[PDB]
């Protein structure tokens, strides 16, 4: 039944094994905020007046100024200090939740599969009665001291670490930070909740006085004892209706079709490590100048701080709309920015990921509709990616080859160097014409046809086929071949002095930038002595 279900989920359980996990997550979010969340490096990241192209999830999330942004990581650290102790716990979770999902939703490049877990585990632990055992609220309130907690404090937490352990096994069918310690600290949730009363019995008698209470736990208000109420019934709409989306959001890719791509899509909730096989031999930002039509080949990573905008279609459009307002400061009024990104596969198969003729500033991208201007990965060329081993094994060590796949209307202007003598082409699928601009002659190639190329010149290979044409570049470095023819006990001490710079610089710079709100701004020559005070090694 439904009334029988909520009586099961609100059954009084022991509050102790939740309260170790409240501590060991609240303590591992004390070590985390200096190291990984970037309190050591907010100054170079959210600097005042600096033109940086952000990548937030919602585009209305504009980051605060750096005077205020050191307060947001302080409320996060005041929140993760009361969630450590268990102090003022329904406020110290909301002071850790709301400035985490403002920080974590502010940088799409900062998403991964462990810093999304802490944004989940701080959302469950906000609604949970974790401060019943071993708290300060227990040492200030009697009815929050060693009192029985409902089972949905344990059923959700056993169901969240189940799904992370389950979907990461199912996603295998196709320097990680604190993740190696939280999943070791979360493993005492799957044990019986009597385990923090077992090791204190193995402890001596005099050590039992600073350790918390050992007796049998009292009943509480928040349970159903052998009909439930409004607090009790919403623990059954949070046990399942939260765990339903946690079984659904890793497979919510086909509804967020503006985000998803060839391999992963929007990284974060996937639970599977991303592959580094791309290696990206090209980017070419090509903007049209306003009102003149002139061409500017812009530098690739000018107004960004990460290289995640090239592998994904969502971060490109936000980078193409942030560049659409910055470039008027450099005499480019209305830019028409066309990206030409050659995503390379592990050793071969170089092909574009975005359409280089379309204006990414104006072209429509909706988060649930299909993205139009993404070129598809040629998965018909994945049996040709097995055909590479036919060509690789038949050829020797000194003939190196990369493969190219090209779409209609496009061309690859490549410069063969002086080192790459005896360089040939083989057009496999489709029809392309190779034109040497030094020789000014077109030559239409046929399927399987072999043709050499001159060294030290440019060449343009235009696609005239209506199908995606593909070809390969056998090359030999003839000048390189003519060159061939002629302690642990002190590492951790070095690791300790590294991390004590992180704790010192993050603590010192926070109090400097908190002075500007309460005590106003100092002089520029005053703070110059203050900022180099922190950057030194202690």
Ligand X SMILES: *[C@@H]1O[C@H](CO)[C@@H](O[C@@H]2O[C@H](CO)[C@@H](O)[C@H](O)[C@H]2NC(C)=O)[C@H](O)[C@H]1NC(C)=O
Ligand Y SMILES: CC(C)CCC[C@@H](C)[C@H]1CC[C@H]2[C@@H]3CC=C4C[C@@H](O)CC[C@]4(C)[C@H]3CC[C@]12C
Positions touching ligand Y (CB under 6 A) are 97-98, 101-102, 105, 120, 123, 245, 249
Report what 437 binds from ligand Y, ligand X, none; CB cut-off 5-8 Å by kind: ligand X
Q: Which is nearer to ligand X, 207 or 437 (CB)?
A: 437
Distances, alpha carbon 456 to alpha carbons 414, 427, 443, 453, 477, in Å: 11, 22, 19, 10, 12
- Closest distance to ligand X from the beta carbon of 441 (Å): 8
Report what 101 binds from ligand X, ligand Y, none; CB cut-off 5-8 Å by kind: ligand Y
Report what 123 binds from ligand X, ligand Y, none; CB cut-off 5-8 Å by kind: ligand Y
The verdict on whether 45 is a catalytic residue reads: no
Written as one string, the DSSP assignment of 127-170 is: HS-GGGSSSSSTTT-STTSSB-EETHHHHHHHHHHHHHHHHHHH
Q: Which is nearer to ligand X, 20 or 461 (CB)?
A: 461
- Among residues 172, 226, 329, 441, the one annotated as catalytic is 172
In a 13 Å sphere around the CA of 240, the CA atoms on its Cβ side amount to 10
Q: Which is nearer to ligand X, 96 or 338 (CB)?
A: 338
Q: Which is nearer to ligand Y, 246 or 304 (CB)?
A: 246
H or E segment at 498?
helix 488-518
Q: Which is nearer to ligand Y, 266 or 461 (CB)?
A: 266
- Closest distance to ligand X from the beta carbon of 411 (Å): 6
- Closest distance to ligand Y from the beta carbon of 110 (Å): 15
Instruction: Mention every residue, 6+ apart, whose C-beta is less than 8 A from residue 150.
Output: 9, 10, 11, 12, 13, 129, 222, 223, 224, 232, 235
Report what 530 binds from ligand Y, ligand X, none; CB cut-off 5-8 Å by kind: none
Cα dihedral 341, 46, 118, 243 in deg (nearest 10): -60
Binding segment for ligand X (CB under 6 A), chosen from 58-66, 219-227, 236-244, 431-439, is 431-439
Report what 98 binds from ligand Y, ligand X, none; CB cut-off 5-8 Å by kind: ligand Y
Report what 409 binds from ligand X, ligand Y, none; CB cut-off 5-8 Å by kind: ligand X
Measure the CA–CA gap between 146 and 46, rounded to whole angstroms.
Answer: 44
- Closest distance to ligand Y from the beta carbon of 73 (Å): 14
Q: Which is nearer to ligand X, 256 or 433 (CB)?
A: 433
What does the chain come to in residues? 538
Window 370-409: residues binding ligand X (CB under 6 A): 409
Written as one string, the DSSP assignment of 441-488 is: EEEE--TT-EEEE-TTSEEEEEE--SS-EEEEEEE--HHHHHHHH--H
Report what 533 binds from ligand X, ligand Y, none; CB cut-off 5-8 Å by kind: none
User: Do residues 150 and 13 make contact, with C-beta atoms less than 8 angstroms apart?
Assistant: yes
- Closest distance to ligand X from the beta carbon of 320 (Å): 23
Q: Which is nearer to ligand X, 387 or 460 (CB)?
A: 460
Out of 305, 414, 424, 433, point to the residue binding ligand X (CB under 6 A): 433
Binding segment for ligand X (CB under 6 A), chosen from 146-154, 257-265, 292-300, 434-442, is 434-442
Backbone φ and ψ for 433, nearest 5 degrees, come out as -115, 130
Measure the CA–CA gap between 148 and 130, rounded to whole angstroms.
Answer: 10
Window 435-454: residues binding ligand X (CB under 6 A): 435, 437, 442
Strands 336-339 and 295-298: unpaired
User: Do residues 464 and 433 make contact, with C-beta atoms less than 8 angstroms apart?
Assistant: yes
Window 295-324: residues binding ligand X (CB under 6 A): none
Report what 59 binds from ligand Y, ligand X, none; CB cut-off 5-8 Å by kind: none
Written as one string, the DSSP assignment of 172-215 is: GG---TTHHHHHHHSGGGTS-TTGGGTTTTSS-SGGGTTS---S
Q: Which is nearer to ligand X, 81 or 436 (CB)?
A: 436
Strands 400-406 and 350-352: parallel
* Residues 458-477, mask of contacts with ligand X (x by CB under 6 A): --x-x-x-------------
| Bridge partner list, 435 | 442, 460
Report what 249 binds from ligand X, ligand Y, none; CB cut-off 5-8 Å by kind: ligand Y
CA 162: distance to chain centroid? 22
Binding segment for ligand X (CB under 6 A), chosen from 225-233, 429-437, 484-492, 516-524, is 429-437
Q: Which is nearer to ligand Y, 249 or 401 (CB)?
A: 249
Instruction: Mention every residue, 6+ apart, whose C-beta is less than 8 A from residue 362.
Output: 336
- Write out the residues near ligand X by the rule CB under 6 A: 409, 411, 433, 435, 437, 442, 460, 462, 464
Residues designated as active site? 172
């Amino acid at each position: 039944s439904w009334r029988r279900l909520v009586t099961l989920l609100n059954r009084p359980t022991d509050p102790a094994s939740l309260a170790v996990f409240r501590f060991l997550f609240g303590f591992l979010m004390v070590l985390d905020i200096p190291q990984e969340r970037g309190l050591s490096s907010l100054d170079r990241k959210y600097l005042d007046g600096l033109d940086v192209c952000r990548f937030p999830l919602l585009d209305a999330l504009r980051p605060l100024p750096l005077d205020w942004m050191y307060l947001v990581y302080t409320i996060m650290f005041l929140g993760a200090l009361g969630m450590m102790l268990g102090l003022c716990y329904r406020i110290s979770c909301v002071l850790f939740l709301l400035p985490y999902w403002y920080v974590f939703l502010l940088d799409k490049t900062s998403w991964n599969n462990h810093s999304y877990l802490y944004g989940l585990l701080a959302f469950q632990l906000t609604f949970m009665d974790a401060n019943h055992y071993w708290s300060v609220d227990g040492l200030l309130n009697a009815h929050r001291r060693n009192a029985h907690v409902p089972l949905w404090n344990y059923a959700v937490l056993r169901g969240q670490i189940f799904i992370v352990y389950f979907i990461a096994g199912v996603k295998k069918l196709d320097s990680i930070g604190m993740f190696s310690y939280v999943m070791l600290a979360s493993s005492p949730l799957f044990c019986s909740p009597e385990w923090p009363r077992k090791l204190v019995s193995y402890c001596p008698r005099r050590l039992q006085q600073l350790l918390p209470l050992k007796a049998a736990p009292q009943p509480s208000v928040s349970c159903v004892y052998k009909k439930p109420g409004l607090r009790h019934q919403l623990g059954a709409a949070f046990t399942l209706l939260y765990l339903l989306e946690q079984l659904f959001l890793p497979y919510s890719h086909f509804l967020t079709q503006g985000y998803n791509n060839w391999t992963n899509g929007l990284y974060g909730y996937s639970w599977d490590m991303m592959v580094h096989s791309r290696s990206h031999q090209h980017v070419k930002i090509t903007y049209r100048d306003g009102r003149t039509g002139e061409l500017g080949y812009l530098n690739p990573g000018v107004f960004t701080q990460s290289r995640r905008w090239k592998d994904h279609a969502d971060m490109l459009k936000q980078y193409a709309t942030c560049l659409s307002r910055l470039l008027p400061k450099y005499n480019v009024t209305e830019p028409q920015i066309y990206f030409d990104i050659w995503v390379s596969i592990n050793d071969r198969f170089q092909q574009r990921i975005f359409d280089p003729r379309v204006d990414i500033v104006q072209a429509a991208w909706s988060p649930f509709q299909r993205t139009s201007w993404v070129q598809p990965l040629l998965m018909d060329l994945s049996p040709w990616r097995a055909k590479l081993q036919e060509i690789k094994s038949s050829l020797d060590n000194h003939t190196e080859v990369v493969f190219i796949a090209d779409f209609p209307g496009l061309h690859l202007e490549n410069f063969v160097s002086e080192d790459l003598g005896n360089t040939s082409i083989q057009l496999l699928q489709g029809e392309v014409t190779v034109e040497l601009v030094a020789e000014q002659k077109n030559q239409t190639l046929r399927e399987g046809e072999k043709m050499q190329l001159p060294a030290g010149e440019y060449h343009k290979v235009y696609t005239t086929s209506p199908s995606p044409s593909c070809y390969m570049y056998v090359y030999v470095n003839t000048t390189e071949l003519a060159l061939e023819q002629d302690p642990f006990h002190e590492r951790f001490f070095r690791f300790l002095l590294r991390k004590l710079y992180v704790f010192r610089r993050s603590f010192l710079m926070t109090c400097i930038s908190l002075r500007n709100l309460i005590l106003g701004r100092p002089s520029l020559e005053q703070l110059a002595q203050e900022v180099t005070y922190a950057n030194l090694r202690p």
